[PDB]
Amino acid sequence: GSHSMRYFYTSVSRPGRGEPRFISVGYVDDTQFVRFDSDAASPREEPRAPWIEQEGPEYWDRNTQIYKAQAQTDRESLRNLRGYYNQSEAGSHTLQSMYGCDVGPDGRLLRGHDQYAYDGKDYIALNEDLRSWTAADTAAQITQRKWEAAREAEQRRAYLEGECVEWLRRYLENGKDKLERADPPKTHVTHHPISDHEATLRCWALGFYPAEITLTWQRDGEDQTQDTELVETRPAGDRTFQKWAAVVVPSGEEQRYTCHVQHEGLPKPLTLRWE
């Protein structure tokens, strides 16, 4: 189907604690496959998925150099930005970057992204044409004039149409067993008395991939979504995810309630009852 590759960068100034920290993470779909953290001892790009480990020393060495150069460029961006906003040298500030590509089932480019936030707010973004910028305020219009003069958009486009798509396709072949395949959840229903006559029924989906999932309670086939408590999907910590959905039911009427589980890993949606 469709696929995505993203790099997320965070640069944080820490005046009077140390030099700014730089953290990069790479993701294919919902899977983290690399990381770089400037606070690690002698920092290097490190593998976070088994299928990337086979990349040779040139891969790791060059990417490490890229992150160190990007971290330095971000330190200069942070100094420039507190210039533009006339901000104190004593404050901690945050520059975030996100970029990458979406490809269709054919492996052709659908869309490219290259966007930034300063102190939690949209700053500048590459438009869908991958040729022009949208600035959020007059500070970002400075960056925009600079980046137009330097033809930054064409540097971004070359990555998004070239290496982004070509490396994503390589990762989708090498990690196809974990990226092209879904892992269904382990499922069960638990029973939790809350008062004298009522029980919470909690429908559990554990260790599923990808994150996208629908858990629905029915009572005698009737949708109970309006009375259902859903927790935010959460990482299991092994690359898989967790979710549950809870309804309050009358004690003894539990067999009226079906939990319906929809996930790409399930050939047919599941129907579960408290047992």
């Binding site: 060059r62 890229i66 150069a69 990007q70 930005l81 970029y99 960056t143």
Partner: peptide, 9 residues
């Protein structure tokens, strides 16, 4: 693989 750095803001 990550994109090469270019200009500062």
């Amino acid at each position: 693989e990550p994109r090469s750095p270019s200009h500062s803001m």
